[PDB]
């Protein structure tokens, strides 16, 4: 036997609220970045070439 993923997670990080919050702080960081990255990409996909990011070429450095 081994602990379910959650039980492992639990005993490492959520017994002590000090570790729990530490977690959350860490998590909030890591999360923000991937969300953005992923969320942004999704959004840009739906407007391909409609946004300046796509269009900068035309009048850039000759």
């Amino acid at each position: 036997v081994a602990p379910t993923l959650t039980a492992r997670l639990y005993s490492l990080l959520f017994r002590r609220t000090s570790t729990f919050a530490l977690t959350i702080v860490v998590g909030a960081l890591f999360f923000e970045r991937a969300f953005d990255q992923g969320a942004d990409a999704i959004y840009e996909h739906i407007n391909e070439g409609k946004l300046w990011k796509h269009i900068k070429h035309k009048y850039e450095n000759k």
Partner: protein, 241 residues
Amino acid sequence: SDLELHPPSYPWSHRGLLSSLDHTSIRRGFQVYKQVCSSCHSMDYVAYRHLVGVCYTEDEAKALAEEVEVQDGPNEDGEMFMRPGKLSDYFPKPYPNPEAARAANNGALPPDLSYIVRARHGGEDYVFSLLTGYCEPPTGVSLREGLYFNPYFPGQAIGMAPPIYNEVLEFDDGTPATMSQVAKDVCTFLRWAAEPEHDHRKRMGLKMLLMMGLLLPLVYAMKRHKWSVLKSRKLAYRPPK
């Protein structure tokens, strides 16, 4: 009390929740405003800030904004000795002040296009169907020359010269300048000047929607766990009787 015709939900790249603005459209449209429209209608809250919003570079728009200050420049604003250079200057007022503006168009007062899209009821659709809407006066109707007949104006008459006509201008790339093709581009640039923030906002909305689902689901689970005990409890009565 005249029936007013209403705008189609014209097919727009952005009609959809996640759909965003098409800058190339913006770009094109911009020029339309600038060449076709700058002449009588102003855009006060629009600065020469297309840069990233319109894909014009900072050198590109600087230049673009320089010539507009060389010809229409701050001499119409009150900067006696001002010429090319500046970027904080807003689009050049067609006339010194509104009263003049009505005289040039004979009593009528060219509405600031800044917010037309969001101002007048009916959005870009109306704006597009107005410009693109011009038909023959109806049998038995009379029309003072200024009073051109337009199928979509409240009072069934507008003081508007040939808004846009084929081959009015020319775009850099080569986009076929059709009356309508140009209006598709003009409207879009207007949509943006009306709600520049909204185009950026729509992306946040997509993120918000994704965030909300994860959050909405998570909140319910927390509520159930917290409210689980109340549902679980058993109540019974046991008197000796």
